[PDB]
Symmetry: D2
Amino acid sequence: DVEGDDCLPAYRHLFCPDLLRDKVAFITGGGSGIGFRIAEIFMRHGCHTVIASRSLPRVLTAARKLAGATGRRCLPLSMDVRAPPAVMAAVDQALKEFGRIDILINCAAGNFLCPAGALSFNAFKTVMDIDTSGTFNVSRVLYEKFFRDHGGVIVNITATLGNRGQALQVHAGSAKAAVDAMTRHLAVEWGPQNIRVNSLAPGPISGTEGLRRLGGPQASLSTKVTASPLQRLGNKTEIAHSVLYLASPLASYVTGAVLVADGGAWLTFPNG
Amino acid sequence: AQPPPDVEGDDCLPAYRHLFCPDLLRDKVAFITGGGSGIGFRIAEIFMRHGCHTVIASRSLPRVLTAARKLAGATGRRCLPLSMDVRAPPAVMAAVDQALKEFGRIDILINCAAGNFLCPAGALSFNAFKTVMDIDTSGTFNVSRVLYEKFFRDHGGVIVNITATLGNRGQALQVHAGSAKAAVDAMTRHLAVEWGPQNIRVNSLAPGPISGTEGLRRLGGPQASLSTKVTASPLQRLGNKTEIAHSVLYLASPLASYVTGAVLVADGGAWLTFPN
Amino acid sequence: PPPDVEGDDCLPAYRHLFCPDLLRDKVAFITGGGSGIGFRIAEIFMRHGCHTVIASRSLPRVLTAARKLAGATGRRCLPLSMDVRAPPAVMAAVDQALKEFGRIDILINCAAGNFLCPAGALSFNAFKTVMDIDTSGTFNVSRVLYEKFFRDHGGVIVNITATLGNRGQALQVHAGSAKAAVDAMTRHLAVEWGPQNIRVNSLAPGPISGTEGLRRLGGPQASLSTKVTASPLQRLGNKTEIAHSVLYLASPLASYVTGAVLVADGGAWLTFPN
Amino acid sequence: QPPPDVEGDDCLPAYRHLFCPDLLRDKVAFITGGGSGIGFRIAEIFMRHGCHTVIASRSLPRVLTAARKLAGATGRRCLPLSMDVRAPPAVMAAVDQALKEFGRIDILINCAAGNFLCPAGALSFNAFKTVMDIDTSGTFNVSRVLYEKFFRDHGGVIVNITATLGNRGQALQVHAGSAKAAVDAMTRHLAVEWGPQNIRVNSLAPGPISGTEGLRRLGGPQASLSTKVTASPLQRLGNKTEIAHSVLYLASPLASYVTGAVLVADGGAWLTFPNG
Ligand SMILES: CCCCCC(=O)SCCNC(=O)CCNC(=O)[C@H](O)C(C)(C)COP(=O)(O)OP(=O)(O)OC[C@H]1O[C@@H](n2cnc3c(N)ncnc32)[C@H](O)[C@@H]1OP(=O)(O)O
Ligand SMILES: CCCCCC(=O)SCCNC(=O)CCNC(=O)[C@H](O)C(C)(C)COP(=O)(O)OP(=O)(O)OC[C@H]1O[C@@H](n2cnc3c(N)ncnc32)[C@H](O)[C@@H]1OP(=O)(O)O
Ligand SMILES: CCCCCC(=O)SCCNC(=O)CCNC(=O)[C@H](O)C(C)(C)COP(=O)(O)OP(=O)(O)OC[C@H]1O[C@@H](n2cnc3c(N)ncnc32)[C@H](O)[C@@H]1OP(=O)(O)O
Ligand SMILES: CCCCCC(=O)SCCNC(=O)CCNC(=O)[C@H](O)C(C)(C)COP(=O)(O)OP(=O)(O)OC[C@H]1O[C@@H](n2cnc3c(N)ncnc32)[C@H](O)[C@@H]1OP(=O)(O)O
Ligand SMILES: NC(=O)c1ccc[n+]([C@@H]2O[C@H](COP(=O)([O-])OP(=O)(O)OC[C@H]3O[C@@H](n4cnc5c(N)ncnc54)[C@H](OP(=O)(O)O)[C@@H]3O)[C@@H](O)[C@H]2O)c1
Ligand SMILES: NC(=O)c1ccc[n+]([C@@H]2O[C@H](COP(=O)([O-])OP(=O)(O)OC[C@H]3O[C@@H](n4cnc5c(N)ncnc54)[C@H](OP(=O)(O)O)[C@@H]3O)[C@@H](O)[C@H]2O)c1
Ligand SMILES: NC(=O)c1ccc[n+]([C@@H]2O[C@H](COP(=O)([O-])OP(=O)(O)OC[C@H]3O[C@@H](n4cnc5c(N)ncnc54)[C@H](OP(=O)(O)O)[C@@H]3O)[C@@H](O)[C@H]2O)c1
Ligand SMILES: NC(=O)c1ccc[n+]([C@@H]2O[C@H](COP(=O)([O-])OP(=O)(O)OC[C@H]3O[C@@H](n4cnc5c(N)ncnc54)[C@H](OP(=O)(O)O)[C@@H]3O)[C@@H](O)[C@H]2O)c1
């Protein structure tokens, strides 16, 4: 893996390189962090991407690196997942450029550490809007604009925070638990349109804004990482492999599932 | 086996036999959002029948006034009716100040306020989804958060969140409510962990299909097909609001001194067998 | 927190929060009722008008319990020797109970076995013995109860379980696995037996003072008190607290509750180290 | 549009790689129940990815017939062994013989199980305990022997085949639901203890799968099954190849960061299937 939002210098295939040949994946948050590596790894298996987030310069920069490293197409778009007309405009544009969308990865999210007693009403609601309503919004627009009529696959990038009520995280754990339930609800309603919907819940991942923001001090982090079952942080590529699995015809019979890829961290990490 | 008595409407029970001691919550005060109708009305009544005063808070001032008169009249306890939207933190803050000025303490918070309706996820508008999130999830947070600041942080207290089982199986026509209620269940865990040291217990209670409630009216669907699924459910009957109020009273009371961070399902096993 | 005593002795006083007649003239059959949690459960039931049958392997253990329980409460306590793994002995014990009281209203599956052991060092027979006592044994007394009385008259079952299996607690593969099976069993029996008017729920305790489980598995005093003070309610639970939640589930106040797992652990599984 | 399958315990007559065919190159997988149903298809698919297999169950005819077909179809080695997961000394012999023959074991798939429909009231103690013994004690016995004999010192991957039965307490299945739920917990326990020796442990819980003894015994009548399958999210039964794909994913370097997890691969079936 690479720490920054840059592409791998080399890659060995474990899935066939034509696994998503000529498919198109729409990736919210695909300009940094996990969403960046997911876009890269999809493109190394023949997939074209659309990457969409608020920051136009961020997606433009990412798109040039992704296309450069892989030779597939990456369409960068500016859109806030909370603004349905912008989501609609983005999906219209993707359809016009590529003609099809096969996979939606809902990776956009926001998080920060804060005691629940100190978190403002707006702060709590901002996270629910971005993670939960934003995931609903983008799924809801895809369904309507393409997936209802053509089938499709969704992966929701979630978390394990809500499992044990991770301190300082009431906002993110609540929103992410909402998205996991949302995964089952959509899996039930939309499966008969040939749409699969699963969640993938990463553990602590090196080279991501999430870890830089939420990981805490270095010394306290190593101790919890060393006491976790695989004894290390996960990396962006490993997460992208799991997401790629779930988005691919190799998960043809998998829907309504939450796959945890955390190295067993949620089983042992401290809380309180 | 006979359930305890209930009445279909938002009226008090004409008789009641105690199974908890009548002084279980002697002179305590409970703040109940949505205490003017349905489950929250019956919760308020049963609490007041165990010695508790209540504050009942929801949007509609006529609704809580009508409710408050009935509740005091049937129980000899004090009920303060307050108009307050759980989504509007200045309104929640003013309602909590008024309650504390009236009573000088609040011991229990019941988050019962919510919104729901049947709608396919493919026809649900963005505003519709978000509105449910706002009332169930953000409103429960806002009221808990304001209670924390104004009293519980310094004095302890007990929260009971009224949730649902909708999200366990992804119940059709219900993505909004099931998502909202699953967030609240996580919030229960989160607050129990952070607020435990302040002597605050937080739990969820998740009801099954309940007779005499607007949620059954709106969500239960056609009578004949509702009967089929109830009869096929393990206790073969709808729950009633008084049964749900007993489970809430259990969690809100010193009988649950060691219960925090837990979700108690009171649904007669419905989620295990209902169709999806 | 309501008072408790460390030993298998009755409370010297007790404040009622349920009505004293909550279980008037019911009969509860309680496996493991001669020590620890089950003994306090028998006591608290009997202080609510209920008679008890307490059954475990050691007749000495249940004889001395029954004497203490009947003396403290003025209700009846029948002590029986019975291994939950042994259908003929389980059948005999339930026949005796019915001969004695003419009814059983409530079953509490509290009998269990446990100890700390790393998975790689645990023998095949040690793993299977825990499975046998906790899971097959609970099934055994439950089905025997069904066939002899609950099928035709209704009843209530509470299974005492654990949170060990949620995060896969180290040194506890056997007990975590066994208790997660009983929680599934709770849902299965609730479904099949609900239409005969039988409710089935699980109660999963946290770390409880005054118990063999805490003595055996709590570990050194100083690492125990560190995790305890780092847990949400910052204390151990006590046996009276668990009995109160068990009594709740066993009682008509939980008329609409079945197939549920109620966790009573002061939030300890959310925060305890693994 | 699923990958192809054959109904009987025969190899696929054609195949298209979606994983690289060297994904498990020169590894050895020990598979209990590897001579029929889902375990047969796991062995084949692993063999098509460069893996040698050892298949172990009670019936020698079964695993003899299987190992010939598997070697024939793939060009890899398949060591068949009579072995009862319930007998530790036979488990120890079989693992010793696998290690003698191959020099290594990389992967363990615990697929051996037993099941049948029976109401709890008609299920005897011995019947319940039998299913607990094969499914739970057996999966423990095999993992424990592998651990000591090889995985402790060399690392490894275990996949336990489980089920969703215990989620909603599926009728007529108290035995299998209980045993499988115990296995999903053991997955978590083993991952926590054995992770630091470089061993991953995950569960894979299949839905109703065509071409299996489990479907034949449990699926019930055709008409009633079709109805429930047609009303499930993907509107079809899973097949053995799809399950093999998921199991291979978990057993492979693509799942390097996955441990203590349960992957449900059931086409959403547990969400909607009736629990009559
Ligand atoms: C383990 C990780 C898994 C979980 C998910 C992730 O990791 S995501 C990985 C980490 N990456 C990110 O979060 C990247 C994207 N994040 C963001 O954009 C931000 O952090 C954000 C979510 C607040 C930004 O959104 P917006 O611009 O919409 O909102 P804005 O900054 O106006 O803030 C809205 C409210 O949140 C409050 N707020 C913002 N930061 C806060 C903080 N650190 N602690 C407390 N409260 C805070 C603000 O004060 C304000 O409340 P008031 O109005 O009361 O002042
Ligand atoms: C097991 C069963 C569990 C049941 C438990 C429960 O959850 S609660 C028990 C049920 N009782 C209830 O009171 C349900 C709550 N009552 C309500 O409907 C609530 O008052 C509410 C959720 C709509 C909130 O009302 P508001 O006045 O804030 O909102 P408003 O009426 O402006 O509607 C907000 C958005 O929702 C959409 N909307 C409203 N009703 C809708 C419906 N039946 N089907 C589809 N969409 C609907 C609206 O058109 C609007 O979207 P646009 O902007 O697109 O027009
Ligand atoms: C936080 C939640 C925790 C809750 C706590 C609980 O669940 S209840 C916990 C507290 N209470 C109790 O356990 C009291 C009852 N316990 C018991 O009776 C026993 O300890 C028991 C569980 C083993 C059951 O006794 P049995 O007579 O049936 O079994 P027996 O004595 O033959 O032992 C069976 C196998 O287990 C192994 N064994 C026994 N104790 C062991 C130990 N401390 N460490 C490792 N292995 C052990 C034996 O060596 C033997 O294996 P070999 O044949 O291979 O030699
Ligand atoms: C939707 C999700 C689905 C989930 C999927 C799954 O897990 S199912 C996938 C697995 N499917 C299978 O292939 C099952 C194949 N396995 C089998 O060998 C058998 O059914 C078995 C486990 C019982 C066989 O083992 P044994 O030969 O050791 O057992 P044996 O016949 O001696 O029986 C042991 C005890 O069980 C009782 N028993 C056995 N079969 C029974 C039945 N159909 N109904 C009632 N009781 C039965 C016996 O009478 C005896 O108890 P008494 O001593 O009282 O007489
Ligand atoms: N890192 C971890 O250890 C970890 C652990 C568990 C879960 N996760 C999850 O993994 C995902 C990515 O995490 P990360 O650590 O990789 O953080 P990251 O790089 O900050 O990714 C979050 C992305 O969200 C986009 N985004 C935020 N708000 C948005 C909005 N309103 N509309 C559209 N786009 C928005 C951001 O781009 P803009 O700023 O340009 O909008 C950014 O690319 C998140 O879903 C997170 O919850 C991460
Ligand atoms: N009935 C069931 O079968 C069932 C099943 C599972 C869960 N539940 C849960 O049970 C609780 C009670 O539901 P119920 O069926 O009895 O329905 P209900 O009578 O309609 O109660 C909901 C209450 O919420 C109040 N409310 C709605 N929005 C609000 C807001 N923004 N601010 C403040 N108050 C608000 C309403 O009063 P105003 O209109 O006056 O504001 C109302 O009194 C809910 O949490 C519900 O999700 C019910
Ligand atoms: N203490 C805690 O912190 C804690 C935490 C979570 C769960 N629990 C659960 O609470 C319950 C009681 O635990 P405890 O700590 O109070 O331990 P305890 O006093 O040792 O109780 C266990 C009882 O089970 C009986 N028993 C054991 N094997 C038996 C068999 N084969 N047949 C019949 N009876 C059998 C024992 O009596 P005989 O020796 O006379 O048979 C003993 O009375 C158990 O289910 C335990 O798993 C306790
Ligand atoms: N088929 C489904 O729809 C479905 C659904 C959920 C889960 N599953 C699970 O998938 C796995 C395979 O099931 P299947 O439906 O494919 O049925 P299956 O072909 O009968 O497979 C079960 C295998 O277990 C072996 N076995 C049984 N007891 C054993 C013992 N004591 N020791 C060693 N081996 C033993 C059997 O062989 P011997 O008789 O030769 O020992 C048989 O090969 C099972 O774990 C089952 O629980 C299946």
